[PDB]
A paper describes a structure:
[name] was expressed from Escherichia coli and purified as a holo-form containing approximately 1.6 iron atoms per protein, as determined by ferrozine analysis. The diferric form (met-[name]) exhibited two absorption maxima at 325 and 375 nm, which are well-established to arise from oxo to ferric LMCT transitions in the oxo–dicarboxylate-bridged met-Hrs.1b,c,8 Resonance Raman (rR) spectra of [name] gave a characteristic peak at 499 cm–1 for the symmetric stretching Fe–Ooxo–Fe vibrational mode. The met-[name] protein was crystallized, and the structure of the oxo-bridged diiron site13 was determined by X-ray crystallographic analysis at a resolution of 1.9 Å. The overall structure of the met-[name] is similar to that of the met form of WT (met-WT) (RSMD value, 0.324).10 Surprisingly, H119 coordinates to Fe1 in the crystal structure in place of the conserved H118 ligand residue in WT. The coordination geometry of other His residues and carboxylate ligands is almost identical to that of met-WT (ESI†). A computational study of the [name] diiron site yielded alternative structures in which either H118 or H119 coordinates to the Fe1.14 It is, thus, expected that either H118 or H119 coordination would be stable in [name] in solution. Based on this observation together with the crystal structure and calculated optimized structures, we propose two conformations for [name]: H118off/H119on and H118on/H119off. In the latter case, the H119 residue is capable of forming a hydrogen bonding interaction with an exogenous ligand. Motivated by the differing reactivity of WT and [name] toward [name], we tested the promotion of oxidation of external substrates by these proteins. Fig. 4b demonstrates that [name] promotes oxidation of guaiacol by [name], as shown by the clear increase in absorption at 470 nm assigned to the oxidized guaiacol product, whereas, under the same conditions, WT does not.
Despite these functional differences, all of these proteins have a carboxylate-bridged diiron active site within a four-helix bundle protein folding motif.2a,6 The coordination sphere and the environment surrounding the diiron site in these proteins have apparently evolved to optimize a variety of reactions with O2. As a target protein for engineering the coordination sphere, we have selected [name]-Hr,8 which contains the histidine-rich coordination sphere and exhibits spectroscopic properties characteristic of all Hrs, but contains a larger substrate-accessible tunnel within the four-helix bundle compared to classical Hrs. As for classical Hrs, the diiron site of [name]-Hr reversibly binds O2 but shows more rapid autoxidation. Herein, we report another engineered variant [name]-Hr, [name], of the same residue, in which alteration of the coordination sphere generates the capability of [name]-dependent oxidation of exogenous substrates.
Numbering used by the authors: 4 to 136
The structure:
Amino acid sequence: DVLVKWSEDLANLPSIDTQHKRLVDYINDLYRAARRRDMDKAREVFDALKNYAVEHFGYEERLFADYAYPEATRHKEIHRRFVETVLKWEKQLAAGDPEVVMTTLRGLVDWLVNHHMKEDKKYEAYLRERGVS
Ligand SMILES: [Ca+2]
């Protein structure tokens, strides 16, 4: 049923929470598809998850710019390097190999949710003080 679950450990601004939650939803959609061995749907879901992640990263970057966040550069580059990883995964998924599926799911879970979404909390106080929600 579920591979990962958003939790209080990840709480951030309410707009950021909605996008982080929707990313969690995409990961679990991808897991359900890969589990059923429906690889066409799994690739479709992965495509949507990539595009959503890019747009979520871009939402954060716009907030960084708008609010003159001091660590905009570092954070944007961390995003950029992860997109590069996703694009590589996307290519590797073309051949539908169980091993590649797992690399992807574990990378999304281990790095995006369990690491990067926690790291996102670092901009929270700064943006909240300036009235962002
Ligand atoms: Ca093969």
